[PDB]
Amino acid sequence: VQPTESIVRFPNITNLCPFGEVFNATRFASVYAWNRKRISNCVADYSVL
């Protein structure tokens, strides 16, 4: 019997990346004083970008 389709499963998405705050910051950093943080242990939803 041949496999009739392919099924793919993973846990639910959770804990999105802080990009959602970064690109909504009205206080966005001046280039003479640029600022950063490590996005880690997160769902990097780059498809939304």
Ligand X SMILES: *[C@@H]1O[C@H](CO)[C@@H](O[C@@H]2O[C@H](CO)[C@@H](O[C@@H]3O[C@H](CO)[C@@H](O)[C@H](O)[C@@H]3O)[C@H](O)[C@H]2NC(C)=O)[C@H](O)[C@H]1NC(C)=O
Binding mask 7-26 for ligand X (x = CB under 6 A): ------------xx--xx--
What gap in Å lies between CA 45 and CA 49, rounded to an integer?
Answer: 8
How many residues of this chain bind ligand X (CB under 6 A)? 5
Which residues, in sequence order, are CB contacts of 15 under 8 Å at separation 6+? 41, 42, 43
Q: Which partner in ligand X, another protein, none is near 18 (CB below 5 to 8 A by kind)?
A: none
| Nearest-angstrom CA–CA distance, 30 and 8 | 44
Residues at the contact surface with another protein, assessed by CB under 8 A: 38, 40-41
Residues at the contact surface with ligand X, assessed by CB under 6 A: 19-20, 23-24, 48
